């Protein structure tokens, strides 16, 4: 349902008759894993046969598709591919059976599953460590750079959870070098750094006095106010919304010659979407982005004023583990678009014949089936033609040398930093690892300190909808963002839910 409909159009002049061809994807249904012989006969596949005959233990996936035919003078269960099933999961034929019949299927009751079978070979997915999304991190920069502090964030949506874009706010000016010490930001798909005041004005809040009321919540702090002084004067001449939005569009990687009448309307998309998309993407909600932008600048200056340490990149609370679920969704997303474009490219030829396509001839199940098999068998995380630049080693042959080694291998985690880059920080055992990853178990050699192993009582969060939490916060006294003023609210606590500033509460202790 991420891209739920395909749409075509032709303005029939050949008595104009707009004929939109539309295909809608509906419910998903799953079947138990099935071996289909060259004969044609089918039966339930159990893993022991799959290992012996070098088969893939996988389930056929069927998808409802619906055709519709708009015409204006002015299907059913199509098979889309096979998905490998994790042994002992809910969709594996061993999950039932019960101890008596397990022995008849030649399966060992001590085998706890957690792995896949691809061409007879047992493949386990290795947890991939990444930085958290939707969090602000501040780092200091090295001496031969005009920048001294940088704030960074990678924005990723909640639904799907997938990456979108990355954004930075750099503070220029060295120590007594760099003259005007102003602040410019970096926006996705714009070639050059844009001063902060300009983007504030470009969102609909233009007079200085309101801008500073969104950032600094302490009118006495003259040190912080003095550092924002050059930013006002270097963006003074941009005195209204329209010339601000146009200043942006004249840099954003587009074509040459889209004129002011539209170059604004192209930049309004780069501001509404791609810039902080985790907050919201519907229209008429620019108050949330303006308030959030002020928070970032506030955090940037606290570190530059030496009132707060720079963030520790190795703090485990700022980290996430991608396991089997999230990793497959990202791969399935890429392959399903590839299947989609092959359907679209096939309709433009098969409708010029004006012949009703039999649907089953427009879904090649080899795209998903070969895609998932290849990536799980080699560990190359991407399209086969792009094997470099893609991440390697996500899937590995399950070590079965001894029983202890099987348990460790299924609980391994990997940080994909490299072998390039010496130093020590990602390799060290950080204090916040206590009780979450083992302090002892780590490989010798090149991977030392980068590959880690989950402590015995660790667990991984499956994920939970944020919507019930919002309802609970407003029922117990949280006040909206339109009601908030630093002069009136000089002491209340800010409330974050998955990194988006959603409200303020004046009595946090009871809450």
């Amino acid at each position: 349902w991420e891209e739920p409909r395909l749409i075509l159009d032709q303005p029939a002049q050949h008595d104009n008759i707009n004929k939109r061809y539309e295909i809608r994807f509906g419910k998903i249904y799953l079947s138990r894993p099935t071996m289909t012989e060259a004969d044609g006969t089918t039966h339930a596949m159990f893993p022991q046969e799959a290992r012996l005959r070098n088969l893939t233990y996988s389930s056929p996936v069927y998808l409802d598709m619906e055709k519709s035919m708009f015409t204006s003078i002015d299907g059913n269960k199509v098979h889309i591919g096979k998905v490998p099933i994790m042994l002992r999961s809910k969709f594996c034929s061993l999950r039932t059976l019960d101890e008596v019949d397990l022995y008849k299927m030649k399966e060992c009751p001590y085998d706890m599953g957690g792995y896949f079978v691809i061409n007879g070979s047992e493949k386990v997915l290795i947890a991939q460590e990444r930085s958290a999304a939707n969090i602000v991190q501040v780092f200091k920069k090295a001496a031969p750079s005009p920048i001294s502090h940088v704030a960074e964030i990678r924005s990723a949506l909640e639904k799907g959870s997938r990456l979108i874009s990355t954004m930075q706010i750099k503070l220029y000016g060295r120590e007594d070098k760099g003259t005007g010490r102003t602040i410019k930001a970096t926006l996705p798909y714009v070639k050059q750094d844009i001063p902060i005041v300009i983007v504030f004005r470009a969102l609909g809040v233009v007079p200085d006095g309101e801008i500073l009321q969104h950032i600094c919540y302490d009118e006495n702090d003259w040190q912080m106010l003095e550092m924002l002084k050059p930013c006002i004067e270097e963006g003074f001449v941009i005195q209204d919304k329209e010339v601000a939005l146009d200043f942006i569009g004249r840099r954003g990687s587009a074509a040459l010659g889209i004129r002011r009448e539209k170059r604004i309307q192209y930049a309004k998309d780069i501001l509404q979407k791609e810039l902080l998309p985790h907050i919201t993407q519907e229209e008429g909600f620019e108050t949330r982005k303006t308030f959030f932008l002020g928070y970032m600048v506030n955090r940037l200056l606290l570190c530059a004023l030496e009132r707060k340490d720079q963030d520790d990149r190795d703090h485990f609370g700022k980290k996430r583990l991608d396991l089997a679920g999230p990793l497959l969704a990202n791969l399935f997303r890429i392959l399903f678009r590839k299947l989609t474009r092959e359907i679209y490219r096939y309709m433009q030829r098969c409708i010029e014949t004006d012949r009703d396509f039999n649907l089953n001839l427009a879904v090649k199940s080899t795209t998903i089936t070969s895609g998932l098999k290849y990536s799980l068998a080699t560990g190359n995380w991407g399209e086969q033609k792009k094997a470099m630049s893609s991440r390697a080693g996500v899937s590995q042959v399950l070590n079965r040398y001894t029983y202890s080694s099987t348990l460790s291998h299924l609980r391994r985690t990997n940080t994909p930093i490299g072998r390039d880059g010496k130093l020590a920080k990602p390799r060290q055992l950080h204090n916040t690892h206590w009780g979450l990853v083992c302090p002892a178990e780590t490989p010798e050699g090149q991977a030392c300190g980068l590959v880690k192993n989950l402590s015995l009582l660790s667990g991984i969060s499956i994920g939970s909808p944020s919507e019930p939490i919002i309802n609970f916060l407003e029922e117990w006294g949280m006040e909206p963002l339109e009601d908030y003023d630093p002069a009136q609210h000089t002491k209340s606590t800010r409330i974050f839910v998955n990194g988006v500033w959603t409200g303020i509460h004046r009595d946090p202790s009871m809450l």
């Binding site: 303005p11 002049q13 050949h14 074509a255 040459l256």
Partner: protein, 214 residues
């Protein structure tokens, strides 16, 4: 006379445009649909013609008066490279863009398809309509030896031997003419019809082996 149709400075300009390889005909098609659909509206597509030459891979040529019309013709076309790569053609280069361009009985050609692919053959005759040509070919036969063919699993070339066919596996049709397994052999050579598009008539290089034989 064709010489009175040469282009002049009063004629529209022609621009070339880079397109995805193999998609040149599709782009020409798409341009025609856009032109015809917009005829008589307030925003007509102001191109006159567009075309694509096989000899010129990856290019479409478009006839118009203003460059903006070229951009208009290609807008949204998924087969066109987004880089602002169009180029102007000189009037003195126009007719060469539209240049349209053998085979005689008794001459040699090389076969392009089937078990005889790559083999030298004499042109014996052509069909009345003008499509397929009867070729005289050194056969590649087995005399039904393992019956109960491809170009990778074919037989060596050797003249048809009717007494070998008589012995091993045949219809006499005339002096020196036999039909054997529904093919015709005259004085040891296969006579078989091939599409003219299935033979090569140009730049043939006889091999060492062919010089020894013919």
């Amino acid at each position: 006379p064709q010489r009175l149709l040469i282009p002049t400075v009063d004629d529209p300009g022609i621009w070339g445009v880079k397109v995805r390889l193999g998609k040149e005909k599709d782009v020409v098609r798409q341009i025609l649909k856009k032109k015809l659909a917009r005829e008589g509206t307030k925003n007509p597509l102001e191109i006159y013609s567009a075309f694509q030459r096989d000899s010129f891979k990856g290019h479409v040529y478009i006839e118009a008066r203003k460059a903006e019309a070229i951009n208009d013709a290609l807008k949204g076309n998924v087969n066109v490279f987004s880089n602002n790569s169009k180029f102007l053609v000189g009037i003195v280069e126009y007719k060469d863009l539209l240049r349209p361009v053998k085979l005689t009985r008794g001459s040699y050609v090389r076969v392009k398809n089937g078990k005889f692919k790559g083999d030298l053959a004499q042109v014996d005759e052509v069909l009345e309509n003008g499509l397929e040509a009867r070729l005289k070919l050194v056969p590649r036969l087995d005399y039904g030896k393992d019956l109960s063919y491809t170009s990778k699993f074919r037989p060596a070339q050797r003249l048809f031997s009717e007494a070998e066919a008589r012995v091993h596996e045949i219809r006499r049709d005339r002096d020196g003419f036999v039909t054997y397994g529904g093919e015709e052999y005259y004085e040891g050579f296969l006579y078989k019809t091939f599409r003219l598009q299935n033979l090569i008539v140009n730049s043939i290089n006889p091999t060492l082996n062919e010089l020894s034989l013919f």
